[PDB]
Amino acid sequence: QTTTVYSLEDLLPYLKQDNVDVKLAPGTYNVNGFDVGEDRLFSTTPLFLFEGSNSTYDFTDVKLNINTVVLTKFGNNEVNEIQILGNNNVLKNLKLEDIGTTAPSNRAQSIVIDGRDNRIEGFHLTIRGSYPYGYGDAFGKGGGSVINHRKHSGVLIRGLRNHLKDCTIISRSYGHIVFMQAASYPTVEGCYIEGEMRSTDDMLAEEGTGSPADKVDFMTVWGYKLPAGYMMSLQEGGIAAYNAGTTYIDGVEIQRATDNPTVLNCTIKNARTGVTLAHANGTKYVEGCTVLGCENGYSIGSGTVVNCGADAIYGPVFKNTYGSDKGYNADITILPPSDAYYNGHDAVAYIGGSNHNLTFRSEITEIPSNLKIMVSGDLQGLRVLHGSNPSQNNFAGTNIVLRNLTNFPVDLHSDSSNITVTSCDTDNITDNGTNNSIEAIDC
């Protein structure tokens, strides 16, 4: 029943059909600029548009090389390499690599998952080609940028009950690695997700070169000159959910927030955030995850983070996003450093909002003097200085259980109230709050 094809040309008609079982034969397939045009292999974008439903596509031992010049061959329009519009499809085992670093004319996504009940499993994706590449989001990630951007993100999960499973996603592009827009019940499971980092000090060393950042005197979109002493991802979110998107399911165009996301047994390295789901609605659940060398570890707003780890070399392992955060329950291990420390945020965690139950565990004995668990206060976060992003900083925390099974110090700010703290040591706890309880635990 499986049909095997031996070229991209013979693959494309099956994408339009329902209930097919198709295999693209092992080999290397190249997509170049000359493959785009009216009489060419790819006359439209998305390049591979999966419109059928109830189909299975096997890409075992397939290497698909897409030249990044293709991101410029469709005018000033978004280019998606793969988009799934149908339902109940399974795509497996493709190795997809962007060749070169040519930026999109507008913007690009490697994979977009619409429809419902689709699964992409076992893919190996390498994302390349974006502008500007080397500043993270310092000079703009949305409208009103200081340096105008041509972003290129990895996997965009939308639709309903769509599933990214056992994939490796490597990004060397300015964009999210895995993100969700208008996705209901998305699941990310068993994935390895990886960006790369650059220090703000290395960016500031562009002074006098005539670089794009040098020409704006390093004035960030946050309203201040780029501060020294931070490590930034060149990517955006590793696994990030946003509240405003459009998706299509069964011909219906839907504009909604992401809801009910689940993230299981993923490892996320060198992204702006490990897992951020604060903007998603419904039930948020994160379990078994490992976050290494990200600017922020876990920020889900409300829900459960359990049996998860993060190191603190570049930023806090935990952050409450807003003072509106309620019901965030977490059990997070602060992992040994994956690399040298370079944490300009002066915090291992920033806690606020209300009715949280937070446990931190760690075997670390070598504690950098600037790292502390903060409950309320003025976070020295890269994007929240000098009143920038004001709702994400300087807010109160009330009625929170904090179980500090670590050697990290704790600072309870004046805006903290009714914090129930238990800690291995109470001598390194500063309490300036109201009606807080501090009790010692024996290891």
Author numbering: 1 to 443
The authors write:
FdlA from Flavobacterium sp. SA-0082 is an endo-type fucoidan-degrading enzyme that cleaves the sulfated fuco-glucuronomannan (SFGM) through a lytic mechanism. We show that the FdlA-NTD adopts a right-handed parallel β-helix fold, and possesses a substrate binding site composed of a long groove and a unique alkaline pocket. Our structural, biochemical, and enzymological analyses strongly suggest that FdlA-NTD utilizes catalytic residues different from other β-helix polysaccharide lyases, potentially representing a novel polysaccharide lyase family. Here, we report crystal structures and enzymological characterization of wild type (WT) and eight single mutants of the catalytic N-terminal domain (NTD) of FdlA, revealing its unique substrate binding pocket and identifying the key catalytic residues.
We first measured the enzymatic activity of 12 mutants and found that eight of them (D137A, K141A, H176A, F179A, E236A, R240A, Y242A, and Y242F) almost completely abolished their activities, H279A mutant retained approximately 65% of the activity compared with WT, while mutations of Asn243, Arg272, and Tyr322 to Ala only negligibly affect their activities. Two positively charged residues Lys141 and Arg240 have their side chains pointing closely to the C-5 atom at the +1 subsite, hence are potential candidates for a catalytic base. In contrast, the R240A mutant exhibits visible structural changes around the active site. Specifically, the Try242 residue was rotated approx. 90 degrees, and shifted toward Ala240. As it constitutes the catalytic acid, the hydroxyl group of the Tyr242 side chain is essential for the enzymatic activity, and its improper positioning may severely affect the catalysis of the enzyme. These structures suggested that the loss of activity of the R240A mutant may be due to the shift of the Tyr242 side chain. Based on our structural and docking models, several positively charged residues such as Arg240, His176, and Lys141, located near the +1 subsite, potentially serve as neutralizers in FdlA-NTD, weakening the negative charge of the C-5 carboxyl group at +1 subsite, and making the C-5 proton susceptible to the attack by a Brønsted base. Next, the positively charged residues including Arg240 and His176, which are located near the +1 subsite, neutralize the C-5 carboxyl group of D-GlcUA at +1 subsite, thus reducing the pKa of the C-5 proton, making it more susceptible to the attack by a base.
